[PDB]
Every structure is written in structure tokens, then in C-alpha cells.
């Protein structure tokens, strides 16, 4: 919400064209998805991309009812109790190699401004080996450190990726904000610690699937829900851009606070997050609340939020309702509700609406149902799939066949490589239907039977 117009500034090119290209499968299966629209004068929608990208941001909620903050410190108690409270500073050093049970800083993604118009990388700024940052990049991160923000430009543009037909024809697309490489070694230094902790431990406790594994965590994810009496599935609409800056406090108050164990300027960096400066072509704005996408925090901060956010519709929805009758899974705005009661979600749709929040009956078409169970559910765009002791993650049919049918020239063989996981869950007949196009054009591809026993391995 809340977007106040800049002094223009440099033209900073966003990408009016996509790298994705129809596979031999794509007039097989025929999927009602298509790459998003990048361009103004793209033919297949009337709509002007950069319109509908802007023409949203009307404005978050200035203020937020009193039961966000105690959801969020007894939420907090419950997360600090586990994994408890010496979430430090972690040093440049250890941010770029990341801590043990941790992955690296990723080199091949982009370092952000100024240093895409000069034409650099991530390893061009630092030195990986001494963990030294070149003395502009050092001041940067200096004046940071001094509670300055000020320099920081989010580089903002399209997403490109398949979208389905009606967002297609809507120029609906998503934006990508990616900060400059200072600003994400800094966030990782000053939640890295707790982070690698939060995402080696998912789970109900945690209420979180954050540096999971399907193959293996599905079973870990359908036992511990299986018990319960009903599983509900509930997804937001544009749930990043709509945390309002009370949301962003209440996080660095009750959530990430010094008593919590951590950085004295973990507050200063999610106002960064919260009041952020962006680019976009010559355009230069500013936007008070929405969570910036990029870096590897932003899945784990969504996630909090959304254990928060769903529970305070619960409380204002429900009266003498308790925090431990609800168990959550999710995984950033992907929200997962087990528990014994019987709740009725169009209840809490109304409730949350007047919060700024907003949630759907996802996928459906309105109407939230009462009943619902594990069998019924869908996360993270599979669903739980019970064979014997464990739970297969089945991705659906729809899913498969649009990710087989587009592909970037290159990395052809990676991707199908990674497809072949996922199919795999769906069974034989199915898997070979799914690879069949490839294969009648000459395209070898590892049999069902050698992928279904590789996963069966992690197991032994």
C-alpha cells in the first residue's frame, strides 16, 4: 500500500521478454498456462503490464488490532522455547559460507544496484575466499551498520514465469524486488543464526515447512497431522504485499526483539523492508508496507507472519478460543490448518478482511467448506498421498504437464532431471505418459522403476 512517486533517476531496464520456449509437449498436453506478460505491447492482453502492476498499492491498514501483538509474543515464547534465544550477529564470513546444516550465499544471483547497470556480478564486489568486500560495498554495509538505509535501492521488476490464461489476459504478473548484494548479506547476518535454526527443525511445533524435503518430510508432515480430526486448506490473496508497517513493528518488537536474543539493528533492517526504495525503469518510488520479495528471508518471515495473522482471525472470529486448538503448517502465504474443532473459515474471511488481510477457499470457487481432511488438502501445489507407513507428495496433473510443456534453451536436461522426482509420485503409467513426448523425439529419460527406487533409499 502506499505508493508515493520519486524524482526519476537512471533507466533501469526491466525485461520485456521472455526466456521461455514451448518443448515438443506443450501441443500435447495443450495447459492453460502461457508465459506472463513482460511488455506494454504484448498482443495477448489489452491491459498495460506496468498499469496493473501499479495500479494496486491503495493502502495498509495504519493500525492493527491489540490480538496481533499478544498471537505474536505467545507465538515467539512457543518458537524461542524450541529453538531457544542466541540468534546473534553472525560475521560476513559466515554469512557468505553459511553456518553448518546452512546453504551459501548463491553467487550466481544478482547483485543488485548499482551494480546490474555497471554490468557486475555477485563475485565481481567480494572476495568469497577472504569474505572482502570492495571499499564501496564496505562503506555501504558501514553505513548500515550506523542505522542509514538510505542508499538502498530495491531493483523492481516482471517475474518471469508461466502464468495461468486469465492472468495472461490480465497482464497480471508478479513483481521481483531484488535488493542490493550489502543489504542481503546484512539480513543474513542479522537473522542467519536464527534462521539456520528455524529451517532445520519444520513441523507443527514450529508451524512451519521451511527447508523441508517432500520425498522424506511429507511422511513427517502427514503422521503428525494425521491424528487430528480435520485438515483445512486456506490461501491469502497477495498476502506479501498486504503487511501493513504495524505488522513489521510488531516483529521487531515482540517477534525479533534483543530480549529474543538478537541484533540491536534487526529493527533498522525490517524498516527497510517495510518503508523500501525502488526502480523501476526511470521511476523511482517509494512504498510504505509490503514485504520486498528476494533474498532468502523473505519465505521464513512470511511463514511467521502467517501463524500470527491466522490465529488473530481465529481469536476475533471465535471467542474463548485457546492458541493450542489450532496446529498450522505453512510455508510462507501457503497455510495449512489442522485441528480437532470445527471451524468455519468464511467467519474468519470477514474478520481478517477488516484486518487488511485477505483469504480464499483456494482452489475451489468460494465457499469454505466445514468438513475437510488430510486427503483433501493441497500444499505447496501437492497433495498427501498415503501408501502404507508413509505419505508420497502427488504433485498434480495439471502442474506437471505445464512445467513439461514450456523450458529455458540450456538447461533442458536439469530440468527434466528435477521433473522426474516429482512425477515420480504419480506412478508408472503416469510417469511414462507425462515423458512420452521426449521420448518419441529422442530424448532418453531414467526409468520409473530406477527414480521410484532412489526415493525409496532415503528411507533405508
Same mark, same amino acid.
Given at each position: 500500500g502506499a505508493l508515493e512517486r520519486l524524482p526519476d533517476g537512471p533507466r533501469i531496464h526491466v525485461p520485456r521478454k521472455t526466456a521461455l520456449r514451448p518443448t515438443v509437449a506443450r501441443q500435447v498436453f495443450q495447459p492453460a498456462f502461457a508465459p506472463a506478460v513482460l511488455s @506494454? #505491447? &504484448? %498482443? /495477448? !492482453? &489489452?491491459?498495460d503490464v506496468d498499469e496493473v502492476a501499479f495500479s494496486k498499492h491503495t493502502s495498509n491498514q495504519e493500525t492493527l488490532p491489540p490480538v496481533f501483538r499478544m498471537v505474536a509474543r505467545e507465538y515467539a515464547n512457543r518458537v524461542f522455547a524450541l529453538l *531457544? /534465544? &542466541?540468534n546473534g550477529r553472525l560475521s560476513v564470513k559466515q554469512a557468505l559460507? *553459511?553456518? =553448518? *546444516?546452512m546453504d551459501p550465499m548463491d553467487k550466481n544471483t544478482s547483485p543488485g544496484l548499482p551494480y546490474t547497470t555497471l554490468g557486475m556480478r555477485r563475485t565481481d564486489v567480494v572476495?568469497? =575466499? !577472504?569474505a572482502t568486500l570492495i571499499p564501496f560495498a564496505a562503506e555501504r554495509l558501514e553505513k548500515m551498520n550506523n542505522k &542509514? #538505509?538510505?542508499d538502498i535501492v530495491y531493483q523492481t521488476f516482471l517475474k518471469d514465469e508461466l502464468r495461468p490464461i486469465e492472468k495472461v489476459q490480465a497482464a497480471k504478473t508478479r513483481i521481483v524486488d531484488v535488493p542490493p548484494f550489502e543489504h542481503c548479506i546484512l539480513g543474513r547476518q542479522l537473522l542467519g543464526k536464527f534462521a539456520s535454526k528455524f529451517q532445520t527443525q519444520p513441523g507443527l511445533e514450529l508451524g512451519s515447512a521451511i527447508g523441508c524435503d517432500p520425498d522424506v518430510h511429507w511422511t513427517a508432515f502427514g503422521v503428525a497431522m494425521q491424528g487430528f480430526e480435520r485438515v483445512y486448506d486456506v490461501d491469502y490473496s497477495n498476502f506479501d504485499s498486504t503487511h501493513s508497517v504495524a505488522m513489521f513493528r510488531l516483529l521487531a518488537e515482540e517477534f525479533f526483539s534483543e530480549e529474543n536474543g538478537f541484533d540491536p539493528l534487526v529493527k533498522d533492517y525490517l524498516e527497510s523492508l517495510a518503508i523500501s526504495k525502488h526502480a523501476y525503469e526511470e521511476k523511482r518510488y517509494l512504498i510504505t508496507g509490503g514485504l520486498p520479495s528476494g533474498c532468502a528471508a523473505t519465505s521464513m518471515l512470511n511463514t511467521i507472519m502467517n501463524n500470527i495473522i491466522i490465529r488473530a482471525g481465529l481469536y476475533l472470529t471465535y471467542k474463548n478460543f485457546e492458541f493450542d486448538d489450532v496446529k498450522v503448517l505453512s510455508y510462507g502465504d501457503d497455510l495449512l490448518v489442522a485441528t480437532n474443532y470445527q471451524l468455519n473459515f468464511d467467519r474468519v474471511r470477514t474478520s481478517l478482511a477488516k484486518t487488511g488481510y485477505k483469504i480464499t %477457499?483456494?482452489? @475451489? !470457487?468460494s465457499t469454505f467448506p466445514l468438513e475437510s481432511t488430510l486427503e483433501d488438502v493441497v500444499f505447496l501445489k501437492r497433495k498427501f498421498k498415503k501408501e502404507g507407513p508413509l505419505y508420497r507428495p502427488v504433485m498434480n496433473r495439471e502442474a506437471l504437464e505445464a512445467m513439461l510443456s514450456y523450458y529455458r534453451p540450456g538447461t533442458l536436461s536439469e530440468k527434466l532431471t528435477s521433473i522426474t522426482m516429482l512425477a515420480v509420485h504419480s506412478g508408472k503409467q503416469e510417469y511414462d505418459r507425462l515423458f512420452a513426448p521426449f521420448r518419441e523425439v529422442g530424448v532418453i529419460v531414467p526409468t520409473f522403476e530406477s527414480v521410484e527406487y532412489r526415493w525409496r533409499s532415503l528411507f533405508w
Open positions: @506494454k #505491447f &504484448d %498482443p /495477448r !492482453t &489489452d491491459a *531457544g /534465544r &542466541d559460507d *553459511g553456518l =553448518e *546444516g572476495d568469497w =575466499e !577472504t &542509514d #538505509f538510505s %477457499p483456494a482452489n @475451489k !470457487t
